[PDB]
Amino acid sequence: NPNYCFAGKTSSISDLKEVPRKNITLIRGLGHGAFGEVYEGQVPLQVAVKTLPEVCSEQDELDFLMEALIISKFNHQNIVRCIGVSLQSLPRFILLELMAGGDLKSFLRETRPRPSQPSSLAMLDLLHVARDIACGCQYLEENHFIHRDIAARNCLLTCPGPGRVAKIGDFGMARDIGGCAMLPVKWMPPEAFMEGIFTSKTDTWSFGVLLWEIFSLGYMPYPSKSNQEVLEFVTSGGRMDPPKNCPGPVYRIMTQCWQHQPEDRPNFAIILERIEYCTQDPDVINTALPIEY
Template identity: 45%
Template sequence: MAMKNWTAGTQCVAKKDHCKPKDGEISYHKGDILTLVGPGMRKGEYTARHNTTGEEGQVSGSNLREREALRIDPKLSLMPWFHGKIAGQQAVDKLKPTEDGLFLVRESVRHPGDFVLCVCFSQKVFHYRVIYQDNKLTIDNMQFFDNLIDMIEFYSRNRGAIATLLLKPKKKEGLKSAETKLLKSGWLLDLSKLTLGEIIGEGEFGAVFAGEYAGQRVAVKIIKCDVTAQAFLEETSVMTNLHHKNLVPLLGVILHNGLHIVTELMTKGNLVNFLRSRGRFAVSVIQLLRFALDVCEGMEHLESKKLLHRDLAGRNILVSEDGVAKISDFGLARVGSMAVDNSKLPVKWTAPEALKNKKFSTQSDVWSYGVLLWEIFSYGRQPYPKMTVNEVKECVEKGYRMDPPDECPADVYSIMTSCWQTEPKKRPSFHKLRERLEKELKLHT
């Protein structure tokens, strides 16, 4: 068998149990995730860290397979059993040959907006109307659910008011189960190992909690709306492809109450609050340059993968326990430039051509990076102070640019203004920006 040549940082899935470790080895179970730290002591071995126990030691390469990145696949569905708007008779035809527990969910033709759960039991198909009331779904007015994913999960484990447990989803033609794919590729985590703590953030898509997963401190973004959860599946696919010290790492997902996205916990919060609460007496210019460089290196990595962030701003940069800045929220990260809803665009951070013609590119990310630099060197002030969003739009279009923050080094301000060239082609790449910042850091150290 050819030698596997994995580099440090590669995540692997254990192919079998290894419960009686020899000296220097670590124990693991089939399906556990291990991160390679470097080559092992002997040929064919690696030094690895167990993602959940944190234990480090030797592992045989032949017991591991690489954790696959997920491809963005529009056929991947969190609800492969959802068939959209079809009539009762069509549902009955789809559930042939009948077997107990075979089921699908459809949107009601007679009662638009309501759903129907269709399930086979003793050669018959039962249709349960799912009523939508007070933002909850219910079949029997006893059990209430936030979304369909939740409801199906519940009735797969409890019979409740229906004829039989839901045993086998009837997939809509052409759809693949995201759950199966996540499980196979090693990204589906085990709900029983998760403990949720306090809320640390509220997004428009749901709350973010601090928590613990198998002993590791984590942040958990919970997306309850199933349509949004489906959209976030794409964000998750993007994150499985990205490994870089300046990007917040994805640990995996849990399908329960919608979608839980589990990432490493960045204990020092977002960069804006970090700088505001400490101020210029506690944080040196060298530290500011390091933050700027951290973000730049993360963005250079996205640039190399031809990915855009589209919402680069201080609030989306998180600071780790050891003071490293990492980019989070690839919520809008997409390959290439797709149309985005303009009302949601963060105007003060968005390049003029992106606001005007929705032209997103690495160059528009560079513009946002210039604004982020201004936030860093002003210790977390709101950009374009005292100006309304509409004033900013108008003035920037006419050529207005922000003044340097107090005591900002001249070279850093000139980097900012280079990011704010009107002509996108004239803005530097993240690669070039990194070189300039490294030079600047040498001058200050």
């Protein structure tokens, strides 16, 4: 058993809440997570079940055990809860809070305002998603945990509807810490992909890119640019333009997050202050989002 330390405490696989396999029942697949499936399931309690391929290397497994350890020790409303694990049967299961809304990136793409659904999403919705994740980022920051891949694809939503809550839901990056084309360089600050240096200011840069993902309604960052072109571009002082219709106050948060010097980039308390100010600002939240035909 590997060790894990967080918030002043070491824990071990023994600390994971084993749920007996007989209590768990798979319902439907939900998606392929590169390595292994995720199911909807019941334990009645509804769950997403992250599975470990029965055929996998020893590292695949440690990664898996490690991810459970990480997610279980977090306690916050914008970080996905772990109901427990089922390690004592194959395939091994990690049991998570079922997030009906699915991942944030898919959500933004499929629920973009449309001619048929002209107002499926408003500025205030995105502002609320942003605040949610930044609040989870605040929680990580003040516990000295560096996520390393804050991006829309690693965020989930409780429900499709307006009372939706965004949480951070994947931690397989801070877990692995692969190759160049694997690293998410489009979400990375310059010192991270140049020097391998990670601090809390890493997540601030990444959060700016996520902010861009959110307000563009789910686009790939630096549109039309490859990883290497981004690397040179970002390294030369280039930054993304505002997404379609983005309010200037919101774009300003992004650019503040994309400061070359990490010590010049805000901490998440400041970012929250600024997002709160945007939600209060009628010129921001009255701004209509683009309808794609």
